[PDB]
Amino acid sequence: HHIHTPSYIKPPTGGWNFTPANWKQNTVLVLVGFTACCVGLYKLGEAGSYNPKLKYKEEELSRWNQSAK
Amino acid sequence: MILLCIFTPFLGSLISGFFGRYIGVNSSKWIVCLSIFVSVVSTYILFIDVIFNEIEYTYNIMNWL
């Protein structure tokens, strides 16, 4: 088609319709990489998250209001 | 589940941003679409828990200020 000057302009995003010859090989590695720590996001999220409406009983809060009174 | 809804689109941004040269045009578009879809399914799962069951989620990464 056109002239993309791909001899020396190689940005991280590709530069005018760049698909490397070994794109299938790299795609599987990235898909493995994306999937691997996408589970890591899930494992971290389930451990760290909590319900802020169930941390303290309503009986515990009544004492707080009276004591701070 | 909460970390999946929030940060999965950010991983899709990084992959097409820095690894776009290595996975090509075709696979870069679909992997980013994959990251958004994970946020879609995560959001719908959280929508049922929050709206219909009155459950709140909170993840405190660390202190900022």
């Binding site: 088609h1 791909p6 319709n17 760049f18 698909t19 490397p20 010859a21 070994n22 794109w23 790299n26 | 040269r21 290595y22 090509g24």
Partner: peptide
């Protein structure tokens, strides 16, 4: 067709 050639291996 477009037949966009593939660049060198990366």
């Amino acid at each position: 067709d477009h037949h966009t050639p593939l660049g060198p291996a990366e």
